[PDB]
Symmetry: C3
Subunit: 339 residues, 3 copies
């Protein structure tokens, strides 16, 4: 048996709080130079169907820091998607690595990969959600809480396009009982199916959500978050197309930051298009935390990797008697046996 991390929908608020604490404890060790070897000799498979800096580097660095190794599987290097099915790739890699992640074009690909694998599977971003981004962002919001405010009393406003990141931020904030607002133009807002999911989260947590094109909605924001305008990796919008849709109403500039509040923090998942969704002045300003946010991609990924491997080991414990016997048997073989 095993557990996956495909969506935060299968995790309670309490479970996410455990993941934040675990991640932050590991972070404090490493920043002071103790590298806990919690994943010693473990191997991670890393399937990427799209380009990536933060997610990919975070997984490779995490494995090394914890005593294991991440294997990068680019497009064209593996047979998946043409000569081999998703179910076969899954069953095979279950025999070859200890834990698996994938960034996929279509959400169904990660669902199938997780369902057919006998080892833990992590979603590195699909067209539907970005759950490792969720934990990273939450870690970041915990570290940058406004003075005298609790997490659930905070207002988080996503500005612009209804990307997978926009939805994910909605899912995590509402899960933790916070107040979420998506400020976006008509035709590019979170849809009815998205909103019913936020509604289900809010009944349990006591949080709230709004989806609107009202410019005043930013007022009182403690966190202001944005993403790129050019859409999905495989079907980008042209510069001219996205400008007509979002510019200038949805550009996070200094006057918008001032409209939200003097203490409001700027967040972005990155990469950013400077001059489009955000100005140089904001992203490089004193209230930008999007570089601490990028650091926290690594923070959250270490905690998840450690939690899921701990979970797997508890469900599939090693036999220590058989372990010592096998060790002894290999050592005798190497001592006495020649080719």
């Amino acid at each position: 048996m095993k557990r996956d991390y495909v969506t935060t929908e299968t995790y309670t608020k309490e479970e996410m709080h455990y993941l934040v604490d675990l991640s932050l404890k590991i972070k404090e060790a490493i920043k002071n130079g103790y590298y806990p070897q919690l994943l010693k000799n473990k191997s991670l498979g890393m399937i990427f169907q799209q380009s990536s800096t933060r997610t990919r580097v975070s997984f490779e660095t995490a494995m090394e820091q914890l005593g294991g190794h991440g294997e990068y599987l680019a497009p064209g290097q593996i047979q998946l998607g043409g000569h081999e099915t998703i179910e076969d790739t899954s069953r095979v890699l279950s025999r070859l690595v200890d834990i698996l992640m994938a960034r996929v074009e279509r959400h169904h690909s990660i669902v199938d990969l997780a369902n057919c694998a006998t080892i833990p599977v992590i979603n590195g971003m699909s067209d539907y959600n970005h759950p490792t981004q969720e934990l990273g962002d939450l870690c970041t919001m915990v570290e940058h809480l406004p003075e005298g405010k609790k997490l659930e009393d905070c207002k988080v406003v996503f500005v612009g396009d209804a990307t997978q990141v926009c939805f994910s931020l909605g899912l995590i904030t509402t899960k933790m009982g916070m107040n979420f607002v998506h400020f976006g133009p008509e035709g590019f807002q979170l849809n009815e199916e998205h909103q019913a999911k936020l509604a289900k989260n809010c009944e349990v947590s006591g949080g709230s959500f709004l989806v609107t094109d009202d410019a005043s909605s930013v007022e009182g924001a403690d966190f202001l978050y944005t993403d790129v305008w050019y859409g999905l990796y495989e079907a980008e919008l042209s510069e001219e197309e996205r400008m007509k849709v979002f510019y200038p109403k949805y550009q996070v500039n200094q006057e918008m930051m001032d409209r939200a509040g003097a203490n409001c923090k700027f967040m972005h998942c990155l990469p950013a298009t400077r001059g489009e969704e955000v100005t140089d002045e904001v992203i490089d300003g004193k209230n930008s935390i999007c570089f601490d946010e990028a650091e926290n991609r690594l923070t959250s990924i270490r905690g998840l990797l450690v939690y899921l491997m701990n979970d797997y080991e508890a469900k599939n414990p090693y036999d220590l008697i058989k372990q010592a016997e096998a060790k002894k048997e290999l050592e005798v073989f190497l001592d006495t046996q020649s080719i």
Copy 2:
């Protein structure tokens, strides 16, 4: 001095038996959570001219588990083939890594890579053979013996005369088993292939047959197949391979039943479901191709360890020089500043 693993033609049956035993001992250790650090701080170079999942991941996971590291060198990343010859690449990498593997478009590349390198070299598949697949398949058959001995078993390969087909021929006839290639005219193992299988058998007491007779599958303990689309660089179309192989060479439940109730299904993977094999067979109770994929890792761990142990035995470290060098570096780092 060194040893290579380019073809099992340079290995005796007894040597192949040792490699099996070593690989299985490592597997039982790791299965129970003991990772033997037998390749500590060693670097493997990995040249891939074609796509791979099982071979590539197996070498990377293998090195991590044993205390070392594998480096993936994909096409376009290195200058080999355009601005650099294979002999220079070989001489350069012999100075930069401890051990080398390559999956090549053409067999002469691995031959030349091995002969010019001063470090051990492994063939990760050519157009000619696939020797790490041979050891992995041998490990698999040992674990799934019918009660028969290995040398009493019949192994039928079904379909195209791929490099995997011939490699299975070589390993089975080397171990003294009974081999059949069941394939259509024009796509059978050729006269040069068969002469090598014949040389193996005269030594081992095994047997071989190349035929298009469907009754040849009867009594098979293992029934093995591969894809129909040929070489990576020049694939056969969907319409053309169907005309060549379908339905005669599709491994379906009728064929498995004709082989025998206890016949096991093997396939090197990736498989084209609905072509060389049906969903029913590959997902069925008698399919062992996923155990077989696991054993690509098993066999590769054993090979890396053997070849490095052999290398170390032939080029041993001077422990007096080792301690003197260690002391000198420590004195340097303690006392000297930029």
Copy 3:
């Protein structure tokens, strides 16, 4: 605070001697089977915008041998250059790896990477220079000194095109007080800006330099070095064009080696186009050291990685009290808490 390795122009002769010595001491340890774990659990980011065998393999192997890991970031794998600016990539990776190297198309990219990063940055080759090649060639010339001669006693002649390797070799030889010659045809010689820098090196070092199309300039050389004729990776000179420029006058054949002197050594950064800049007979001959030179790409890279990380740790030391406290708190958490 940190230090970079972008150009040997920021390093004194005494500093370069230290680096050679460190690299040679590490080399002798590893050659005899002792792997010093000087970079335990550290991560190196490797940005490659061009193809590479020696530089890429040296970095990955170097990290494994010293206890760390190198991460390969190829073209198309990261969004830098299209959807992300050089400055943002630098600040982000500063949070995700410990040390960074890049092979860049344009020299301004490595300068910007280094200037914006809070971690050490190594130049893995640009269109301007190639400083890890410089240190490798220095280690190589030290190991192959003529009897009774010092490095500063030696005459080094570079043959052919004014490549970045040509200029770099000029920089490192003049820095160390040696006698450097560029033997190249008019229009393809080191320009006035290059020569002015060599002249300034010579004022301090006691060395000398000459740029000439005179064939007799090879006479009395202790090392004879060459490179390809096809120019830059992005803008290659065709076979017919380059042959018309250089062939046969600038081909390193046995006649040129004999003209240089019986004991003269042949050097080449590689890869070599046999039949163009050099013949089979010379590169495969008894006086060829280019494969030893290739080995010393790894020799020099190990020394550089260690020095820069030691420098960083000295400037940014870990606090051992906070380290132990962080270790204990993590250990307590894993013992007592569950999801």
